RNA sequence: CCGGGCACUCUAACGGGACUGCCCGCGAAAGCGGGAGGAAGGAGGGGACGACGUCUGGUCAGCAUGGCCCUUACGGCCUGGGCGACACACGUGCUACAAUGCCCACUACAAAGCGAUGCCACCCGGCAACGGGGAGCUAAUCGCAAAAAGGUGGGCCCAGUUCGGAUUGGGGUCUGCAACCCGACCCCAUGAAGCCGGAAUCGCUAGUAAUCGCGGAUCAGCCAUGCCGCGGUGAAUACG
């Protein structure tokens, strides 16, 4: 009936539903290449879906918030993943050497005082 | 209807003393909806460490205030028996409409 | 912060803008935080001591 | 062709050309093509002379170009000095008038650097 | 890298030929960290060796930079009071490093007036065996072996 | 490409003195700490000692000097 | 550039409105 | 947006979870190499945290304090000037020198913060700074607010230019008793040096460098390009 997962990445959430029919995707209620499409990076979100041999089979409406696009496109990518696990289990040996299922916990490391960004040092001369 | 609005500094003291609202006025009255968490506000002081130059040092401190808010339906009158004054709390502030 | 300069506090400062802050423990002009009405140095010993209520140490 | 004085812009769009007009920057040229109906686009070999005309009859006088407008900050320079102001002297040491710090920098208006010993 | 052996990062395949080494090849032409404008550049670039060679892109991309790898490189060493330049092998890594390198800078060399135009022609140039980034390949492979006396420097 | 605003401002100090000067005469020179005041035409041929920081100057006032402050022709700083 | 009163980037660096930076 | 509902997102309290626990190999052991399962492994990433002591290190000008010294002035009030001087020299930075770019128009995604003599939606006047009017907000509920780079469309066509905005002339707005010395901001005109920088020299090993914007503290205003934070996009290389 209907498959759901979250997935984030970098400050971003985006909600994945699954729903069986013709393949078109939804984001925040535009098509998937009206949000898209300008980033050649896109397509890679539903790299899941390719991978399980989905494609067509499912159609997916999808809210997406925080981060900027690209980040949202990771995030939408796990989440496709999560619901794609939800609804065959056995589908995450297939999808877990891949790491679709695995979160990426890198995220923008704080800035630190006496330096310019958190790692950046000021230069000097000595003379 | 009653509106509640709890501020303070302290984590425990406002969620340890919203729950005694409450189960008070679970008894005498409504489903008591229950304290909603709010965002906390975090104000942040930075300083330098020494006395005298070395601006490298710095140490900041924050100071937050944390909210809470319960908002119980059915404003019995029977409520405000057990409500009203009884608590603990000290470090905590209490903010009422209708 | 000389004795003299503690002048600051003035109901008639003559003027709103010759008005400025000063910290109320040791008197010091410059880097006075308005929350506090201290400066940044008695600010940090004091919140050392515990007297600020709520101000904690921050890290992330 | 020849608008406001001795200059000619030539080959490329009327906004940009007339830039090359003295008294005229990007503004009183996007303003002189507005009010005299020319499309900005067309270069200037393309200009009818009925628009160049026009052109010329508004921008000529309308403000103050080219000599005139020298002339004129030249007189307001001279006057700045005569009457003994600060921006007189300023003016006559050829120091920066806008009150900027003259310890560092202050190249500019100071031209090239002179060394000497320390 | 004093204690570890440094192991080398993994790239994300390519978004269109599946390849790793395109990748890497647009991340040399990034700048400022815009990725985006990068695969334009090299995409459109990619088009543009089409309807001049007929071939894939991805055959001439590939052999180009097969041209371009270095086989003998030459690096300085304090010997005894003075600094000999010594010729030795590199590394298929280093290789590759170099190469795609010199094909960026020699790409942005070209007096082509656009990206895409400039990636193009030199990538092209290079898989027939001429053009800039070759011409560093030789000319590093003769500075190599011209210094041939000092092999034995090699460490 | 200075600006004030309107309703320009002129110490109140010697505003009243010029015009007490104009009322029965020119009389001689004048002494003015303010050189934050705006020159009015009403000020035109007499002389104003100003206060550099130092001493007074007799800064003599033409009628092309008219809306500049006093400072202005009281130079502060000696150099060279 | 970012240096240039008269421009967008201009004004969004030195952080004000203006002519060139309508507020809508 | 209304009814309606805590499933999801989020918010903020408690709690679970990872310990070389399991498999193979090496080892006397501690442990090392690899693999499985897992969101995460071998210190998962980043903070707070800096030993006995060293530099007769810095600060009596934040405060405290021994000694010494001045007490019609080495104390005190005020107006004005100065800390903003400029032949020069250095440090740290900002903006650039352009087409992987600049400009105009339209359009999309964030986090952390601040807000009552405050933030100021929206309407009108003004080219604009801004002015007048005025709703909401003790603020997850209103405002600052526009995020920018990005995407789409169009212009520029390699030139000191539609690059770059210093310098200077003129006209204004705001704060403030008061912008000469010595404020910021708007508009018109001006349109400098600069074509990637000698010897020398600096930072950074991953969401880092690079790049793009956003907020805050102090403060009437501001010389903030500084500092302290926040997120967007996101590399190269490490033989040794
Ligand atoms: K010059
Ligand atoms: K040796
Ligand atoms: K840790
Ligand atoms: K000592
Ligand atoms: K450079
Ligand atoms: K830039
Ligand atoms: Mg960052
Ligand atoms: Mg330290
Ligand atoms: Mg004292
Ligand atoms: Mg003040
Ligand atoms: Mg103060
Ligand atoms: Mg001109
Ligand atoms: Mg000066
Ligand atoms: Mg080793
Ligand atoms: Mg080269
Ligand atoms: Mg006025
Ligand atoms: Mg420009
Ligand atoms: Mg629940
Ligand atoms: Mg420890
Ligand atoms: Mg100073
Ligand atoms: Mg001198
Ligand atoms: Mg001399
Ligand atoms: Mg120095
Ligand atoms: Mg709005
Ligand atoms: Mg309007
Ligand atoms: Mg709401
Ligand atoms: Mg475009
Ligand atoms: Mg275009
Ligand atoms: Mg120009
Ligand atoms: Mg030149
Ligand atoms: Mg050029
Ligand atoms: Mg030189
Ligand atoms: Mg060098
Ligand atoms: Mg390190
Ligand atoms: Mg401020
Ligand atoms: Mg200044
Ligand atoms: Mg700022
Ligand atoms: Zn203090």
Redesign the pocket.
Known sequence: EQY?G?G??????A?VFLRPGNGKVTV?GQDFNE?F???V?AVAALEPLRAVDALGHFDAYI????????????AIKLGIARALVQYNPDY??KL??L?F??????????????????????????? | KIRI?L?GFD??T??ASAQKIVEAARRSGAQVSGP???????????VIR???????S???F?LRT??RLVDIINPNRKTIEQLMTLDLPTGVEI?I?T | ?????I?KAKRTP????????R?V????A??????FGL?R??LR?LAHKGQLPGVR???? | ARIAGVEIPRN??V??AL???????????KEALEKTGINP?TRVKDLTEAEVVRLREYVENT?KLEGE?RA??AA??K??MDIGC??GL??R????????????N????????????? | ??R??????Q?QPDLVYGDVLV??FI????????????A??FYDACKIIQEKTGQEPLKVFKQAVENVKPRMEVRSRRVGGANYQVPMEV?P??Q??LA??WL?QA??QRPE????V??AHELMDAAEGKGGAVKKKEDVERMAEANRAYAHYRW | ??????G??V?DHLLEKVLELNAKGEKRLIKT??????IVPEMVGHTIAV????QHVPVYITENMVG?????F??????? | ?24
């Open positions: 759901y979250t984030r990445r970098k400050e971003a959430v909600r925040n949000y499409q300008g980033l990076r809210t997406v918030r925080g981060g900027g696009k690209s980040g949202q496109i990771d995450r040996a877990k050497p790491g299922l695995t979160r990426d916990a890198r995220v923008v490391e704080r800035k630190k005082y006496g330096k310019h960004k958190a790692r950046r040092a000021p230069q000097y001369s000595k003379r | 609005k501020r984590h425990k406002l969620d909603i968490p709010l965002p906390t506000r975090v104000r942040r002081f930075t020494g006395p005298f130059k070395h601006k490298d710095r140490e900041h924050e944390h909210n903010e409409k | 912060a000389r004795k003299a300069l002048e003559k003027f709103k803008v010759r008005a400025y802050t910290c423990r040791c008197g010091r410059r880097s006075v935080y308005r929350f400066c140095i008695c010993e140490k921050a890290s992330w | 490329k769009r906004d940009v830039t090359y007009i003295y008294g005229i920057g990007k503004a009183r040229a686009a403000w407008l004129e900050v307001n320079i006057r700045l600060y921006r300023r003016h040491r050829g120091l920066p008038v806008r009150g900027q710090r003259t310890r560092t202050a190249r500019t208006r100071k031209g090239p650097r002179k060394t000497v010993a320390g | 890298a004093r570890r052996r440094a192991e080398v990062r790239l990748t890497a991340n040399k032409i990034m700048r400022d960290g815009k990725k985006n404008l990068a334009r550049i590394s890594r280093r590759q490093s795609l390198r960026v790409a942005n007036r656009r990206a895409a400039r990636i | 490409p200075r600006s004030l605003k309107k320009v401002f110490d700490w303010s050189r934050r005041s705006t206060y550099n920081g130092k500049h402050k006093l400072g202005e009281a130079p502060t700083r000696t150099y060279r | 550039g970012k240096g240039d009163r008269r421009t967008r980037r201009g004004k969004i660096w030195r952080g004000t409105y203006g002519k060139y930076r309508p507020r809508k």
